[PDB]
Amino acid sequence: PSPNLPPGFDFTDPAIYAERLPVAEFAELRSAAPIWWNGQDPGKGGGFHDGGFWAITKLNDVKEISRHSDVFSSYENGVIPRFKNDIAREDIEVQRFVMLNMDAPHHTRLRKIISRGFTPRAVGRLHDELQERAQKIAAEAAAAGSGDFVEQVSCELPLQAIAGLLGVPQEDRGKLFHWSNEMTGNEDPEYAHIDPKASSAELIGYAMKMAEEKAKNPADDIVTQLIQADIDGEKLSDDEFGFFVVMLAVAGNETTRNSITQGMMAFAEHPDQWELYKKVRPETAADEIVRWATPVTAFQRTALRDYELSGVQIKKGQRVVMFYRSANFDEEVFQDPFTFNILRNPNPHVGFGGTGAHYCIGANLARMTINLIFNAVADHMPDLKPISAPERLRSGWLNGIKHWQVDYTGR
Ligand code: HEM
């Protein structure tokens, strides 16, 4: 029995996400066709011209694909499943220069090096400065009385996290943030004029300039650690560092921002959870917010060989799209998945991907950013109330909130 979906429904259609999350449609697949071929008409494949893809809606399938990276490749078609329909193939393949879109062994080398900058020590050293900034952000927003939660609360701290990790001087953080905000959102009319390719070129240039500067004058931030050769001569070239910085902007900015915005949307919809958060401040909240927000709706892989997955035959060369937004509400894994429960524990969500070679290296940095900012929101604007509905981002793989008017005070 075919799933009850509209003829031609495409789960990567940006026009859906500009309006809503296709929650009921995902649940229909989980029940009636947990692995479902998503057909795509000619020229409507968001940059991919292969007829469609396998929709992966169950968490254990998402995990199986993510563990078997030897079969399911990130390099072959990249992991973003939707661009503008007219994007040139070469602009897809230039994205192979970031570690996210690499397969082993190239990925293994880069991840090993880049792991130097995401040790628990490197991340935890940012705690106090980020905590201060979180408090300052929330204080300034509340003093404005009312405004755009996305811009006055959610946007800044993720960017300051990246700047702090990289040791970006304060004078430069303005243009770093600008470049990072021009990397995604390309398909929304409000951002139709951003040029992601131009922005990345400038970022790489700035990043390479910082790499050579930091070689001359080592410090104790991670840039020095990344570009200094270890015993085996391993280190990031200047351009490899540039592509690393580009990836941090792509992977660590709007995702965390959107977790914060939608975390607060969840709290506004579930005031008992909000009261419980304000009293207890449970850090488990961070994972339930990420599960609820699932900022990355989906990443894809490409089969390098035939592979049978939960009784479905994936063919060599076919794309499989991991719908984290569906898997994070999988009734077979989660107790009451549609209950927002900041105490959920354990919380095996795949908001940071499925466990495997590409698992989000910034997951704990993100969790700390979320906990710090929501502590500050609780400290400075505990009676925050929305004014109007959120505006969603037109994107086929990012679950974004562009704007959200809130009254930071009671009235
Ligand atoms: C809520 C916030 C975030 C979410 C939802 C998120 C989500 C993800 C996902 C789904 C992946 C792919 C995992 C896979 O394919 O198995 C990923 C990878 C990655 N993330 Fe995150 N991320 C977040 C925050 C961050 C931050 C703050 C950073 C760094 C500052 C970061 C850096 C990375 C990097 C470098 C990768 C590539 C790892 C690799 O390819 O080996 N992310 N992230």
Swiss-Prot record:
Mutant lacking the gene: phenotype: Cells lacking this gene appear to metabolize cholesterol normally, probably due to the ability of Cyp142 to compensate for loss of Cyp125.
GO terms, biological process: biological process involved in interaction with host; cholesterol catabolic process
Annotated pathway: Steroid metabolism; cholesterol degradation
Domain of life of the organism encoding this protein: Bacteria
Binding sites annotated in the UniProt record for heme: 360
EC number: 1.14.15.29
Coiled-coil intervals, chain numbering: none
Reactions catalysed, as given in the entry: cholest-4-en-3-one + 6 reduced [2Fe-2S]-[ferredoxin] + 3 O2 + 5 H(+) = (25S)-3-oxocholest-4-en-26-oate + 6 oxidized [2Fe-2S]-[ferredoxin] + 4 H2O; (25R)-3-oxocholest-4-en-26-ol + 2 reduced [2Fe-2S]-[ferredoxin] + O2 + 2 H(+) = (25R)-3-oxocholest-4-en-26-al + 2 oxidized [2Fe-2S]-[ferredoxin] + 2 H2O; (25R)-3-oxocholest-4-en-26-al + 2 reduced [2Fe-2S]-[ferredoxin] + O2 + H(+) = (25R)-3-oxocholest-4-en-26-oate + 2 oxidized [2Fe-2S]-[ferredoxin] + H2O; cholest-4-en-3-one + 2 reduced [2Fe-2S]-[ferredoxin] + O2 + 2 H(+) = (25S)-3-oxocholest-4-en-26-ol + 2 oxidized [2Fe-2S]-[ferredoxin] + H2O
Expression induction or repression: By cholesterol.
Family as reported in the entry's similarity comment: Belongs to the cytochrome P450 family.
PANTHER family the UniProt entry points to: BIOTIN BIOSYNTHESIS CYTOCHROME P450, P450, PUTATIVE (EUROFUNG)-RELATED
Identification of the protein by name: Steroid C26-monooxygenase
